[PDB]
Amino acid sequence: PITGLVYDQRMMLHHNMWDSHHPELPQRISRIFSRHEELRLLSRCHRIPARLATEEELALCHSSKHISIIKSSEHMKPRDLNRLGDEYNSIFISNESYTCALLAAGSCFNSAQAILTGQVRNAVAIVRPPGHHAEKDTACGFCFFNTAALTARYAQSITRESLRVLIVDWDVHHGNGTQHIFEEDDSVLYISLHRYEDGAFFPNSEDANYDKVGLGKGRGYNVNIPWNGGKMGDPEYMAAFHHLVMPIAREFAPELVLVSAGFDAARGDPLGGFQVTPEGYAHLTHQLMSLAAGRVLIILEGGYNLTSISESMSMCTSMLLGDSPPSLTPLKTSATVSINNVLRAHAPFWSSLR
Numbered sequence: 001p002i003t004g005l006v007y008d009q010r011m012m013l014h015h016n017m018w019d020s021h022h023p024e025l026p027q028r029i030s031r032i033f034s035r036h037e038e039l040r041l042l043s044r045c046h047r048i049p050a051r052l053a054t055e056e057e058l059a060l061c062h063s064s065k066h067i068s069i070i071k072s073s074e075h076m077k078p079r080d081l082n083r084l085g086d087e088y089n090s091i092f093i094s095n096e097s098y099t100c101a102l103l104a105a106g107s108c109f110n111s112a113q114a115i116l117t118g119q120v121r122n123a124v125a126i127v128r129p130p131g132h133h134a135e136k137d138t139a140c141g142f143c144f145f146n147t148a149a150l151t152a153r154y155a156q157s158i159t160r161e162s163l164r165v166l167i168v169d170w171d172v173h174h175g176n177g178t179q180h181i182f183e184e185d186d187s188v189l190y191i192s193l194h195r196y197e198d199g200a201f202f203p204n205s206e207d208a209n210y211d212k213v214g215l216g217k218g219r220g221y222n223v224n225i226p227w228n229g230g231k232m233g234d235p236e237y238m239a240a241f242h243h244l245v246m247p248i249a250r251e252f253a254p255e256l257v258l259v260s261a262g263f264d265a266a267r268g269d270p271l272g273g274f275q276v277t278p279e280g281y282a283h284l285t286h287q288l289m290s291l292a293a294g295r296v297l298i299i300l301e302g303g304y305n306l307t308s309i310s311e312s313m314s315m316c317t318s319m320l321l322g323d324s325p326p327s328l329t330p331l332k333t334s335a336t337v338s339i340n341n342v343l344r345a346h347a348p349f350w351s352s353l354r
């Protein structure tokens with residue numbers, strides 16, 4: 001009955017040398033860690049060390065060319081870092097970026113190992129840069145390697161290829177990279193909730209819509225819950241978990257749950273524009289703890305209001321440690337529309353939705 005925590009200040013070294021106020025700040029992770037100390041959560045956790053992912057581990061999801069190219073950035077002069085970053089959608093690179101991406105992934109492997117060997121029951125990983133936009137063959141959206149996707153493949157590599165892994169992506173953005181990596185896989189159920197706005201919200205692709213249900217043997221194993229029509233908050237998130245995430249997850253019966261835990265749907269976030277509260281994130285975490293015999297690993301993705309992400313992620317760790325969930329309207333019409341669209345898309349695959 002132990003919660004793991006991984007945090008390494010070396011992941012602060014990745015930085016934007018042209019714009020020191022870019023929202024994906026080094027301080028995101030140090031602020032979250034500090035808040036865990038302030039609330040006396042850090043001393044209640046088992047500290048798991050960070051390590052570098054190996055290149056062979058990265059090749060679980062990424063092409064050798066992609067790994068090679070990111071690695072080459074370690075000794076580039078500024079002009080070349082600029083040029084390379086600009087080849088992608090929404091990336092900045094420094095000489096430390098590759099190492100930090102390796103540390104984020106390796107931290108999460110050590111956390112998954114700790115859970116699967118029974119050293120801890122659940123864990124939290126305070127890591128940057130984020131992962132979920134990274135594709136097999138490209139970086140995207142502040143992400144270099146797909147930490148969460150790699151962690152699912154790493155878990156399978158130390159257990160069995162068919163280990164059932166649920167990935168719940170509650171970052172306000174679609175994890176396009178995670179959906180693509182697993183699109184034909186029935187061993188990894190990907191469930192994302194995300195602002196969509198009919199394709200106006202980053203990453204601006206209809207890949208994020210509710211009708212993308214998976215392909216081939218993976219059909220039914222990709223669940224997109226897209227929001228349209230502006231701000232959403234605790235009522236909408238709780239309803240999506242009630243009607244969709246939790247019935248489907250129970251039917252899938254995962255053996256490990258990974259949370260792509262961006263905190264950019266939080267109240268106060270300048271990019272997300274949503275209103276999920278710290279108490280809301282606590283309730284979503286407490287629900288997920290009912291799956292997989294409690295085997296849950298929470299992985300930081302996005303989230304840009306330093307106070308919001310620090311309070312929100314700390315509340316999640318408090319839930320993982322077994323604290324009682326804190327005390328928490330009708331849904332926006334368009335949220336009802338979204339949920340019902342997903343129910344219709346997935347009722348052919350999941351009896352629980354019928």
Ligand SMILES: O=C(NCCc1cc(C(=O)NO)no1)c1ccc(Cl)c(Cl)c1
Nearest residue numbers: 023090141142171173202264271302303
């Ligand atoms: O590039 C930007 N936005 C698009 C890329 C992106 C990815 C994420 C994210 O949180 N993904 O889950 N979030 O954004 C960007 C950069 C600077 C500023 Cl100030 C803003 Cl508002 C956006």
Ligand SMILES: [K+]
Nearest residue numbers: 169171173193
């Ligand atoms: K998401």
Ligand SMILES: [K+]
Nearest residue numbers: 182185188221
């Ligand atoms: K899948």
Ligand SMILES: [Zn+2]
Nearest residue numbers: 171173262302
């Ligand atoms: Zn995000």
